Amino acid sequence: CPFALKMAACQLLLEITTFLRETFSCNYHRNMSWLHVMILLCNQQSFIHPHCYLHHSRSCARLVRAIKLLYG
């Protein structure tokens, strides 16, 4: 699967986490399984290309534009 789909999943996880930390603060809210994975996703990049952060950002922007066009 492409990087952009992974970032879409990351956005979903972000919404999950913000909901959990904005509702339980008014255990699940004390430990999170996916955080480590996120760390890996942040470190699994080339900062020197096939897996450079520039290419990933371009792909993400392309997917965002495609989604905007589809939902237009």
From Swiss-Prot:
The record's account of how the chain is modified after translation: Phosphorylated on tyrosine residues.
Superkingdom of source: Eukaryota
Location of this chain's protein in the cell: Cell membrane
Distribution of this protein across tissues and organs: Moderately expressed in fetal brain, spinal cord, skeletal muscle, thymus, spleen, fetal liver, small intestine, colon, kidney and uterus. Highly expressed in adrenal gland, prostate and testis, as well as in brain and cerebellum.
Cited function: Auxiliary subunit of the NALCN sodium channel complex, a voltage-gated ion channel responsible for the resting Na(+) permeability that controls neuronal excitability. Activated by neuropeptides substance P, neurotensin, and extracellular Ca(2+) that regulates neuronal excitability by controlling the sizes of NALCN-dependent sodium-leak current. UNC80 is essential for NALCN sensitivity to extracellular Ca(2+).
Associated disorder: Hypotonia, infantile, with psychomotor retardation and characteristic facies 2: An autosomal recessive, neurodegenerative disease characterized by severe truncal hypotonia since birth or early infancy, progressive peripheral spasticity, and profound psychomotor developmental delay. Some patients may have seizures.
Family statement: Belongs to the unc-80 family.
Assembly and oligomerization: NALCN complex consists of NALCN and auxiliary subunits, UNC79, UNC80 and NACL1. These auxiliary subunits are essential for the NALCN complex function. Interacts (via N-terminus half) with NALCN; this interaction facilitates NALCN surface localization. Interacts with UNC79. UNC80 bridges NALCN to UNC79.
Record's protein name: Protein unc-80 homolog
Native source species: Homo sapiens
Gene of this entry: UNC80
